[PDB]
């Protein structure tokens, strides 16, 4: 705390007031900083789910490699996570242990889908825009940033009609038709 002198640094080597061992390297903080996660327990509520997928893939790999219960359930879990967007491809089954990850479940959120769809400039501005209530999926407006937008359901992320942001991009390309409110 005072940049210990040399005999002190030798005499108390394990002292660290910020980084502890149970913090696991502050990855809750670090990936919630990356994806701009609002409240604190979302990382760990996703981590329970990654733990459940990895536990099941462990127990399900422990079965013999030939039996159809193993093969069928690994394929069901693999297609389930790929259609949920948590996985990127269903090629190999070691993706169930290596590449399922809280950052994957977070990349599947709604502000991040907004940013990767170019509907905002950054994930903080996407969080601001859907806190301000511009973004609907399908017909109904979505208001919380934690919404998880699956592979089929990211074809329906749009803005609401009558939104000032929809008005300003149409009038940027001066295609604004004021008949249909925007």
């Amino acid at each position: 705390v005072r940049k210990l002198k040399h005999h002190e640094q030798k005499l108390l080597k394990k002292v660290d007031f910020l980084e502890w061992k149970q913090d696991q390297g502050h990855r809750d903080t670090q990936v919630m900083r990356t994806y701009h996660i609002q409240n604190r327990e979302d990382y760990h509520k996703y981590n329970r789910i990654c733990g459940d997928i990895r536990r099941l893939a462990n127990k399900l790999s422990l079965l013999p490699p030939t039996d159809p219960f193993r093969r069928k359930h690994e394929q069901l879990l693999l297609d389930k996570l790929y259609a949920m967007g948590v996985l990127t491809t269903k090629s190999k089954i070691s993706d169930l242990e290596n590449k399922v990850t809280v950052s994957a479940i977070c990349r599947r959120r709604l502000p991040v889908i907004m940013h990767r769809l170019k509907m905002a400039e950054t994930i903080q501005d996407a969080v601001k825009f859907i806190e301000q209530g511009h973004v609907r999926v399908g017909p109904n407006l979505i208001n919380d940033p934690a919404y998880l937008v699956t592979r089929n359901m990211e074809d329906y992320v749009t803005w609401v009609d009558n939104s000032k942001i929809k008005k300003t991009l149409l009038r940027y390309r001066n295609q604004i038709d004021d008949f249909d409110f925007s």
Binding site: I49, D52, I53, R55, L56, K59, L60, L62, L63, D67, F69, H73, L76, L77, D79, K80, L81, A83, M84, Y147, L148, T150, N152, M153
Partner: protein
């Protein structure tokens, strides 16, 4: 002089008859390239039971996380039996009833 490509083959009686008995051999041998219309162990049964329970709980919380837009599991032609019982007894507990037939048809009897 040299020429670029082999010219288009002229279609004479020899190549039509070689083509035709190719078809005759294929069609009497029925070689057609068609389209085609589409208990274990005690320790293994209890391992299977454990990961069946785990997979059911996980699919439940994946669906409630995925805000139940998802894609369903395919199909299972299962087999369920039903005893012959009055549909008064196949109801809920209230003072009334709704139908008083039996749960098996005449032809099922």
């Amino acid at each position: 002089f040299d020429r670029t490509a082999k010219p288009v083959p002229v279609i004479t009686s020899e190549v039509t008859e070689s083509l035709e008995d190719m078809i005759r051999r294929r069609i009497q041998d029925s070689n057609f390239d068609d389209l085609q219309r589409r208990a274990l162990s005690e320790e293994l049964q209890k391992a299977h039971s454990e990961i069946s329970e785990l997979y059911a709980n996980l699919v439940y919380k994946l669906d409630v996380l995925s805000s139940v837009h998802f894609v369903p599991k395919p199909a299972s032609t299962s087999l369920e039996i039903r005893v012959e019982t009055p549909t008064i007894s196949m109801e809920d507990a209230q003072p009334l009833y709704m139908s008083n037939a039996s749960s098996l048809a005449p032809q099922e009897i």
